[PDB]
Design a protein around this ligand. Structure first.
Ligand SMILES: O=[N+]([O-])c1ccc(OP(=O)(O)O)cc1
Ligand SMILES: O=[N+]([O-])c1ccc(OP(=O)(O)O)cc1
Ligand SMILES: O=[N+]([O-])c1ccc(OP(=O)(O)O)cc1
Lengths: 387, 390, 80, 390
């Protein structure tokens, strides 16, 4: 049966998500797709054609792919120290949970940024020795602050471990976007447009809305604590519109970030996902060589007993490569997958995957912050089970 | 023939514009042997240090409330092993948070002993890098001095600890929890218990959580830029003699203000009475406040530290272990300033400091008011006194 | 099959379906008892990593209490 | 000037309906310095505590049988290193079981020293979570008091140990094994040996495994809900003053009942005679029961514990190590109630407790009958006496 529809319709019928779209492609063509629910529960408008989503950290694989392109082109390399491009990142310090501060004993590199092993953290990180100082500095909160200036403020704060030595999901993709700007003399949104979006015909993807985008923007729900005091337990899963403050503007021509901030559509994100199966456009234009794509996808960070975790939530059987998660042990996985399946997700519950063993890609688009229901993994499992 | 190094230290500090006013006294065999004063009550006015000047002693409150706990143990109200949840069920089912966002139930009950040793897993609002201090600040545990002790404890009780009770050491709000548990166990207020069991018998008439009737004109001005409850600083505040803003954390005339870990006003003379008593457990007249057996139980080294040593916000207390009342010198060859084996006492945020040295039958106290001092005046005065007493 | 059908998932805490399994404790061979520090999941049950034992388990810190409770012995008792 | 905290403790316990009747005595320099009684013989009848009241002292039997072992060592019957299998071949070829169902041969012989230190690997029927206690209960080792010591030991000998002899510590039935090995080595009965070598010389006329002829009317009633040999409890039995059913585990008039780890009846006065003797190894008249060298051998700390400390059924004995006769205080800074370095003694299941404190030439004993007390009356009485003796 159509497990994907059953999952999505159950979520809508239980008042857990307002609206959901999905598509799964094989060999670059749709084999499953659908939608459930509405754009917004307040007026129950149907999900529009080419509906627009805040994809949050699904921005990261895109910005990471751009960095790989610049590496291939010789702009910098995995081992390049970031201080070479912005000296504000010379002389970093490292703080610990016992209030001890000392100089970093290793320089932060491009590779560290792409692997979240640089020692940065995130404003919303619970129990973190530095997240209070991120919150005070409004790093995530102040969406109106130019990328360049936000980085100056971040650069003055201590890391939470010595670069290279541990893993922690972090604001490092934003650092990467900034370093890209320093290295190229170009803005990251312009680079993304020219090198990735245009070639893949992703006309609806950017850090601001298309001129006709307002009526297509999905409403966002949920109570997650994104820049306030980190919650000691998850907020109740209730469909109430989320307040994004000034963290995520719709029409700021200078808003650009590395770790979040893109608006996209299901169709646009599917084009990016399909490309990751080969490094080419559908017409056959190369965006990244097979060699460098293999370098980007190979498992690079391996995890101990407790596995990969973010705010203590597990990613069972996953390792980290230069673009996001990668399945390295089906016997440890918590939901259907195959060896080498890779991808990432976003705070508003958007999720995608690429499964090279099946030449398969999939994406679930929805808008819920702080979900207590792992819709992304439920939809991947459903799709896997339908092959 | 040794010169007066005590006066020299105090004088230099005042002449260097580092502290406004400083008073000190060192007693031996219960009688003053060195004493002095330097500077003024306040720098704005240069009013002279009044007779019986009054100081906010902050954590020098801790040895007093700890001593009261020991008296109650001696009297059978509770024991070191008593789980605090027996007296306040709000402390049943504690959780423990870590630096990786992981929360789990505590695997051990918090006891009276844990509170007196700072091994309960509590923290403090100003603790830099702490997995929970952000939640303390949001709750305004320290900032909101007007909140009753009992109500503040209800808010604290809902927060997780930062390690499992008994398994580590971290200087903390646990003495406030102890003051509260004392009230739960006895059905009395901690300020009344302190008044009747300690202050009255020792004639400490100027000591309490609010100013005496004639106290306002005797209150020393407090200086410095330490932030007691704001975002913890990444480096020490500059040492500048500017008056400190205490907000509403340390009221002068709130008849219900009472705490375990700070909040007392006292005077040099009153505190010396307490310190001298600690040499024997008796009042000068010979009333026993605490038997020699239980005083020995309280002073014996109880928490021992591992290479890193005892630290608070990463500042070292070199060669010190912890007993039920505060610090205790356990290795002179690791000490960072003059002392003798067994020397004990504590200090307060505004740079007040005292010690008791049983090998010399000596006590010492320096009183001053500076929050966030970059100069360890307490240890400098102790070292000076040690150097002067053979 | 029920996982494939979406009834629950490997990571589902069992207490979500029967709250009698909230607040489990853990015993050891030295008589020490403490609260469990992790919730039991469907995956734990399928892998025998939940911490349960068996009435007939020799040397087990809890099998005596299973035997006293007749868990295996009392076949007539309803599963629930 | 210190008030009578001993009477206060006892009184409160009786007035709170927590214990039926309590007697205590503290001696210094071999003469009574504090003493008293509180409550009644039995709550049903409220009969007053009789003269020379008799108590089941349970594991306060252990220091007595241990002391007899030391006398026999001094006399050359055996040595600390003697393998017990030399005296009873039933203890040849022991096995060791673990919590994972694995059984293997013991890699070391059990010695006299192992039995006196509870390091032989034996356990006890009531031990919660134990790899072997289920088999002890099936065998009715404790329950069947009517079974001769010699026969019970044959049944025990067939069971595996829970660790290899010498490698760990667990409070156990090993003192019963010792009593038995004493009988094997000497060809005499342990009760006769105790009578001749210890009770007679110390004039302990009311002490033995059966009641004196006029004993029944003097026997204190025993209360409480602890289950001595049933399925071990997952949490403490409620503390309720209801008479306890001892079944046939503790007969009053069985001329062959004798054990190493429990079973003696005694009186406060008789036990104080034993305790006082332990200060010197001599009778009041000056007969040597045990030379100073061997008494020192017996009292020196012999088993040292690792962070977790000494525990029995997970209850702590904080700051205590173990010597050949029972507990010994080795760190006052880890102690959970007042004491001095070197204080030693033991206690019994029905809440009887005694201590000897060589630094004060002091002994103390509290007698009461409550099985499974949730209130540590023994330690409370010790703390009270310590507080009263400077
Ligand atoms: O900017 N943000 O609010 C923000 C940025 C990144 C986040 O992380 P994610 O949940 O992995 O997308 C979550 C929130
Ligand atoms: O409440 N307070 O502001 C506060 C309490 C305790 C303190 O700790 P101290 O520096 O050891 O006195 C410091 C400040
Ligand atoms: O035989 N018994 O019933 C028995 C034997 C030993 C006991 O151990 P205790 O509590 O240390 O006296 C308790 C009970």
């Amino acid at each position: 049966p159509d497990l994907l529809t059953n999952v999505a319709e159950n979520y809508v019928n239980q008042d857990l998500f307002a609206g959901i779209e999905w598509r799964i492609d094989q060999d670059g063509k749709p084999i499953f797709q659908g939608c459930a629910g509405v754009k917004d529960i307040e007026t129950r408008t149907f999900i529009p054609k080419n509906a627009i989503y805040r994809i949050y950290s699904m921005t990261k694989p895109i910005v990471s792919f751009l960095a790989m392109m610049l590496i291939e082109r010789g702009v910098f390399r995995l081992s390049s120290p970031i201080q070479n491009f912005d000296p504000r990142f010379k002389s970093m310090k490292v703080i610990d949970q016992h209030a001890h501060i000392e100089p970093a004993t290793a320089l932060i590199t491009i590779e560290h940024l792409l692997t979240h092993q640089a020692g940065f953290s995130y404003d919303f990180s619970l129990g973190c020795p530095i997240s209070a100082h991120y919150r005070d500095a409004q790093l995530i909160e102040d969406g109106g602050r130019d990328l360049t200036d936000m980085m100056g403020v971040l650069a003055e704060l201590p890391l939470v471990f010595h670069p290279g030595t541990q893993w922690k999901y972090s604001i490092s993709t934003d650092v990467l976007a900034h370093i890209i700007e320093c290295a190229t003399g170009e803005r990251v949104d312009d680079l993304l447009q020219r090198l990735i979006f245009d070639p893949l015909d992703m006309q609806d993807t950017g850090f601001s809305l298309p001129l006709d985008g307002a009526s297509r923007l999905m409403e966002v729900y949920g109570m997650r604590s994104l820049h306030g005091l980190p919650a000691l337990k998850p907020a109740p899963h209730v469909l109430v519109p989320a307040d994004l403050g000034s963290s995520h503007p719709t029409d700021d021509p200078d808003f650009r970030r590395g770790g979040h901030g893109l608006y996209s559509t299901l169709d646009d994100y599917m084009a990016f996902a399909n490309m990751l199966l080969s490094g080419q456009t559908p017409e056959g234009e190369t965006l990244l060589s097979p060699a460098v794509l293999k370098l980007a996808l190979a498992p690079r960070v391996h995890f101990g007993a407790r596995g990969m975790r973010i705010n203590d939530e597990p990613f069972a059987g996953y390792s980290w490569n230069l673009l996001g998660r990668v399945m390295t042990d089906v016997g440890a996985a918590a939901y259907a997958t195959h060896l080498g399946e890779f991808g990432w997700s976003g705070a508003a519950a958007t999720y995608f995957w690429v499964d090279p063993t099946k030449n398969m890609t999939g994406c679930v688009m929805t808008q819920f912050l702080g979900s207590q229901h792992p819709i992304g993994s439920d939809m991947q499992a459903a799709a896997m089970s339908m092959l």
